[PDB]
Amino acid sequence: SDCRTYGFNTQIVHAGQQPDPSTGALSTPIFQTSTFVFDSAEQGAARFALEESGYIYTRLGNPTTDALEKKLAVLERGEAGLATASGISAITTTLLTLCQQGDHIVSASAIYGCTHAFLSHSMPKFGINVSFVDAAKPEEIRAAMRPETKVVYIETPANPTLSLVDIETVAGIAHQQGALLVVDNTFMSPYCQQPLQLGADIVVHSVTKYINGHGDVIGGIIVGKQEFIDQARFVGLKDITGGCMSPFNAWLTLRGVKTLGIRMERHCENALKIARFLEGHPSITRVYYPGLSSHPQYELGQRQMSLPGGIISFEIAGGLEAGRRMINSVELCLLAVSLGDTETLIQHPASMTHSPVAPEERLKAGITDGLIRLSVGLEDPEDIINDLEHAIRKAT
Amino acid sequence: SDCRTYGFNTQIVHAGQQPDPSTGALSTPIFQTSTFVFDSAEQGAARFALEESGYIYTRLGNPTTDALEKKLAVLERGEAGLATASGISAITTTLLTLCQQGDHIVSASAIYGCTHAFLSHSMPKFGINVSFVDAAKPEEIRAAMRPETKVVYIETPANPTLSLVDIETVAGIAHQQGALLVVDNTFMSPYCQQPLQLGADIVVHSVTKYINGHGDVIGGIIVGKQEFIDQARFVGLKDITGGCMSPFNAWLTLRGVKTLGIRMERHCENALKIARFLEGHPSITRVYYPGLSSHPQYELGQRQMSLPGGIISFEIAGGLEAGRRMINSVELCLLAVSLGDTETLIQHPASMTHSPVAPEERLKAGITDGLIRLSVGLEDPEDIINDLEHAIRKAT
Amino acid sequence: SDCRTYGFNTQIVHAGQQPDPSTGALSTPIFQTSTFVFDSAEQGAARFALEESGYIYTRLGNPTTDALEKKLAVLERGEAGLATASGISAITTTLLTLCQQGDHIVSASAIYGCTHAFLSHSMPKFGINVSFVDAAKPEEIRAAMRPETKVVYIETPANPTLSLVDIETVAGIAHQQGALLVVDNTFMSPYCQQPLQLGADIVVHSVTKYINGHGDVIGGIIVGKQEFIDQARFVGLKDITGGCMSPFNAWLTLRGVKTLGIRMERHCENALKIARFLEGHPSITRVYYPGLSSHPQYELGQRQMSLPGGIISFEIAGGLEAGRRMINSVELCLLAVSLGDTETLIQHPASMTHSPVAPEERLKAGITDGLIRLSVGLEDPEDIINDLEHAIRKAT
Amino acid sequence: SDCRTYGFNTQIVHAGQQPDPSTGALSTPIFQTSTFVFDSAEQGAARFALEESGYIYTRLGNPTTDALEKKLAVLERGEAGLATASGISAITTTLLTLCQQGDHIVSASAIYGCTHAFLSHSMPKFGINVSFVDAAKPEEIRAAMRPETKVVYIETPANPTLSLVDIETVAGIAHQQGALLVVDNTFMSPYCQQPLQLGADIVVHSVTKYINGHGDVIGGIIVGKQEFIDQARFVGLKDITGGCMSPFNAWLTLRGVKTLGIRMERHCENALKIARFLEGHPSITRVYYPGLSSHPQYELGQRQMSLPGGIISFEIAGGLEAGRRMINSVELCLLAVSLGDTETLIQHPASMTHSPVAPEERLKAGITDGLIRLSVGLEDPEDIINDLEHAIRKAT
Ligand SMILES: Cc1ncc(COP(=O)(O)O)c(C/N=C2\CONC2=O)c1O
Ligand SMILES: Cc1ncc(COP(=O)(O)O)c(C/N=C2\CONC2=O)c1O
Ligand SMILES: Cc1ncc(COP(=O)(O)O)c(C/N=C2\CONC2=O)c1O
Ligand SMILES: Cc1ncc(COP(=O)(O)O)c(C/N=C2\CONC2=O)c1O
Ligand SMILES: [Cl-]
Ligand SMILES: [Cl-]
Ligand SMILES: [Cl-]
Ligand SMILES: [Cl-]
């Protein structure tokens, strides 16, 4: 009779949700409201004081959104959740809540581009300095820490080449120096990786990806201790970012997350097959996938992740032009940014996202002329493999 | 054949919208998507470069949200719009885009509470200092400006007692000293006040209030010059706040804004009647409404606003206890925070929102024991007056 | 404290709705669910028996939809409401619930086309015969009644030329002969006409038109005595048509109906102005509008309707080709079927809806070569008049 | 590049859908509109004539709904689809389109209750007679056919005890006598059974169940030859039932159906495990599940179905009272009607749905005092088994 005691699939379906109390409606009602009516002046005061429970206004909280926040707290084994307008807003609400002028952050370099831009260009303009390191080398993390360091920030697997970061080891290091460890768990979902269980303090997601799963919501979520989440809600979100989630967005995300287990199983079963295919193809120079035993951090990945994920990166023979030929030749895979949708998505950062950026920053950045990123969907993998095989044969 | 040439009611209905190009659908389609598919690698690069038009990903922009942004730009007579997750996020995305460590803001004191909290407690922690003044006295604004001042920030009418700020005069002052003027136009909507036409640089709204009008969306909008709005989108929103609007939220706001003209007319017709009623009631000590000729800035209000608004504040005889008795005695008016809904809403900040705050800060704050705020809805005003009359008679 | 006692505007806003009981949410929650969970086997039996209140399954009923049904019952001064998938489904659920093989219906001829097709071609194939008459001549109604007659069916105003039907007189006639009177009140809404108050037994609407008002819902509603509505729900809808409304559709319709009063006022103020304009134009041969004193049933219209409506029909000089030229020349008015949207809509049945139909059936049907139907929106009427003036000048 | 050529999982994801043509939006836009605007009078006529393609009005058709209709046509290997307001409306729109006064239907007895009520009580009142038979005995079907017989109507598996009907054999029989075969495929979905491939003429579903899968849509779909579907759309739906689907409902159903393959796999894997558990339990007298080899039509089920389904019926020792004790004792399984949701649902028709019905009709009806129906969800099956084990132990 407590959400937290059942099996993980049962939790994915039930945690945070129950039949509507007034009607018995099974689906979580969409509470698409701005405000909430009090029974009396007294009831109203009690709430605002934070001296009693219940709702006030949707920017502060909402019943639909609370369900999503509780569910994801359960799935990550955290105390509390807070939904946001976007994955970016989960990351910024978190870091702007934690940090102030004079503070320092140690961040992985191999992170999502927009996260990198916030940390590189915006944070320092608020007097918050960021040191970037290769987080696959925990010694670089240690060496960059300063007395001012409040936060160590990592993604794993990391967005270009799916390199990994040893969460338990990094956590120990951050904590030794009095810092918090923030892990962006977007690529894996709680079904595949649980950073809190390994020592992380706070997990953030873009729910836009696998947690929603259906390519129709932009949203984020933050999971952590109740004392942190309260500050993130009542200061970060309320005052600083304003990044509240729409109740309709939460409702969809709750709907999408119901099938998280079965989606992740299929995404990962499909991706392993595709990755093996790509590894045997004479036109493919490299394949980056945690499920291939040639992955340089293969055994860490086996300890830390329950499945190897739905994302594959790979380099095609012939560099830029061949990568451009390849992505213009797929008929099933869809050319787009984003990942974790039911559809297979493909992007060639060098001819697409990074064409005006110099060959030199790209390489610094882990991005070679022939690098393709593939988000594996729920189609028949034979169809995806055939589409790839055809596109690759043409391109090379 | 250009949105901007028609009458204001026609603009409210049509500006920013047209039949769907592929199907002829009259209602703006809800583009409830995360991502967008490119025809080719080439098409994709062109977009990311910002070297061609079209969509990429919903955090950056979306067709439904663009319609709302264009409509509101038209209505405010601004170049460009940007929708946000909330009114707060409109204000913060704006100010965090404009300001960096070492900068200064001159703000009105008589502003929305959560705005006040951001400026008082959060901004300074990013090295951005804020000086608060009585903005009804334009000399206080001038006296507080510093070489570091980037922004002057005002609301008009202002949220407790509906005091006004001379937008044209303040604009002239801010500009003389090289600062921008930001006006929060939430209380009035563009139907009743147009700050850009009076010299303001940027307008922000909580669309949660009268622009949406239906009490079912939390959202914000920012209107200004294209060069500012681009930075607000591609830095502020993309990187810093993450405060993007859901396409469903935009769709509803577009739907709600269709009736803006007719709603504002009725809200204001209703409020004037209620305000006159309250002014003749021997149990009511004061009535704050711009449409009453005893308003201390009555003639400014006549120059600057086309209608006197839908919000009334008033003090009931007997202070705190009588205000508490009064709001517990209404049967039609609903006790809640927020404003600009089709329903009449009432709040007694001293027994509700501000009961744990000391009698002394409250007065500083413009908030007396008997102060009630009333958001006039679209009901029959005789019904609202009778509900008030009954509640007041009981309370006193 | 009873919905039914307040003023009509107050009823439009509040009737059928209240704050959510479990949370205080002001907006009616969207109960977008299929089923409802019982506390026990006992609770479940009680409900199915129809021996206790509460929900079972959304085809039978739903909390969101119930709010809409109660509101519209209040507005029409009927006992009970039942929402449907469409206006057609309101009409068919009603008539298929009432009638069986061997029964007879007396219908107006001047009715909506799809209604006409159901009565002309489908009803008789179920052994239910229909006699069509000119319902503007109550003697034709009397003369067509038979011992088998269960129902007299009318629209007023009627869809081509806005001819009227004397509801009170027809009701008296139908009742004298033991039949029920069904009135389709779509064109007027309850704000402008109340057929139950004049003696009708059952009212039906396409809520797609003015009750929703926003051009984004297909739906219907039926209002009548509880004993009829129960049969319409538990037989007609449950078993025969299956025509249940989506809870999201109901939610939108509830949202749209909030502004019914202010929309109808503006639609009718706009239409009267446009109609006067069209009556003075030398290129316009006829104008059909109840608000023009030359309307042949002008004084009936003054007794029966509170406003003259938002729909205008008119004939342009030069017949078919000029009507085609005219509708291809409007730049603001939108060419489409449907009516009662915030946008101005125009249709030229002879070149559009009825081009393959012979000049001869069209005339029978009330439809002349130059007949244009105009649904007046909420734009500035000067803009609509200018668009019309321009299009008419060009066409003639 | 044709939907129909890919693997079944690929079809579930992609069939009927493509990126939005005007924007590239990946998610099918929600075209939540009533009407559609024409470019000219000419364009409008062309469409109405049925002499050109494109949209007119949402009751007739809509882009979102069309996607769903095309997808499901692909999945069932039929020519065309038509979405409806409910499963009931799919069945009635179909049969009322096909049949007229004097016609005859041969129906299975073991069908959904509301279907039974339509055929038993409503059809005959339109002069359409229905003969009910045990459809597990194809000779009873043959013996009941009459020269007037237009339709043979079956469900398989059938709603109480999951008895089967030999679709290929029944099809051959119906066709021999000049009748059409209609199969309600709701229990299986196209992932598990394809009646058209076995000779059925028309398939109907309640999409409320497994096709949507998420317990938040009431809807139906009809699949068949284009010439039948056109009549079902342009007469049945347009004129008779009015049972059109909301575009939002279609959008959700499209969203839900993306995971159909992976959901059905898990539902059926879970159900087989639960069914084996129930078969070994000394307190359970019978277990009705097609996947148990003791099922009396086990081998037919192996030929006709790809998986044995997600529904299990079973009788508990001690009849009525024990069944009532059992369902009041489950803590995880939810007491509700409906099936095919992500949640496990349970119903005890004798103490719930059929408590006021005499012990005698119930038995006629296949319904014993101890009969429980279980809709297996996506939870961990060990959790469901433990909940059952606990509830059963308590009840007996
Ligand atoms: C790891 C990770 N964290 C955070 C975000 C930010 O989330 P949002 O604000 O977009 O919801 C993304 C977005 N990843 C994207 C976004 O577009 N293409 C991608 O690979 C991401 O991949
Ligand atoms: C003038 C004004 N600006 C901005 C906001 C912030 O907008 P949001 O983020 O809530 O959309 C509010 C909210 N006013 C509220 C909020 O709750 N009660 C009120 O009077 C406001 O009144
Ligand atoms: C008077 C009236 N009754 C019933 C209906 C049927 O409603 P629905 O099923 O479409 O919601 C319409 C539709 N009138 C239309 C429909 O398209 N153009 C019109 O003038 C109508 O005008
Ligand atoms: C086989 C089958 N066909 C058609 C329907 C009708 O579909 P609807 O109109 O409800 O979408 C149901 C509903 N089955 C239900 C409905 O409530 N409990 C059940 O087992 C059904 O099980
Ligand atoms: Cl795949
Ligand atoms: Cl009022
Ligand atoms: Cl107009
Ligand atoms: Cl299970």
Q: Evaluate the radius of gyration of chain A.
A: 22 Å
Which overall shape of chain A is indicated by the principal axes computed on the Cα atoms? globular
Strand order of the largest sheet of chain A: 1-7-6-5-4-2-3
Bound ligands, each once: ligand LCS, chloride ion
Q: Could you please say which CATH topology of the largest domain in chain A applies here? A: Aspartate Aminotransferase, domain 2
- Could you tell me the strand content of chain A as a percent range? 5-15%
- What's the number of domains of chain A? 2
Assigned CATH class of the largest domain in chain A: Alpha Beta
- Rounded to the nearest angstrom, the distance between the terminal CA atoms of chain A is 58 Å
Portion of residues within helices of chain A: 25-40%
Oligomeric form:
homotetramer
Largest sheet of chain A: 7 strands, mixed
Number of helices of chain A: 14
Q: Order of helices and strands of chain A, N to C?
A: HHHEHEHEHEHEEEHHHEHEHEEHEH
Instruction: Determine the most extensive contact between two protein chains.
Output: A-B, 78 and 78 residues
Q: Which homologous superfamily in CATH is the superfamily of the largest domain in chain A?
A: Type I PLP-dependent aspartate aminotransferase-like (Major domain)
| Strand count of chain A | 12
Second rung of CATH, namely the architecture of the largest domain in chain A? 3-Layer(aba) Sandwich
Give the helix/strand class of chain A: alpha/beta
PDB class: lyase
Keywords: aminotransferase class I and II, methionine, lyase
Assembly: tetrameric
Entry title: The crystal structure of methionine gamma-lyase from Citrobacter freundii in complex with L-cycloserine pyridoxal-5'-phosphate
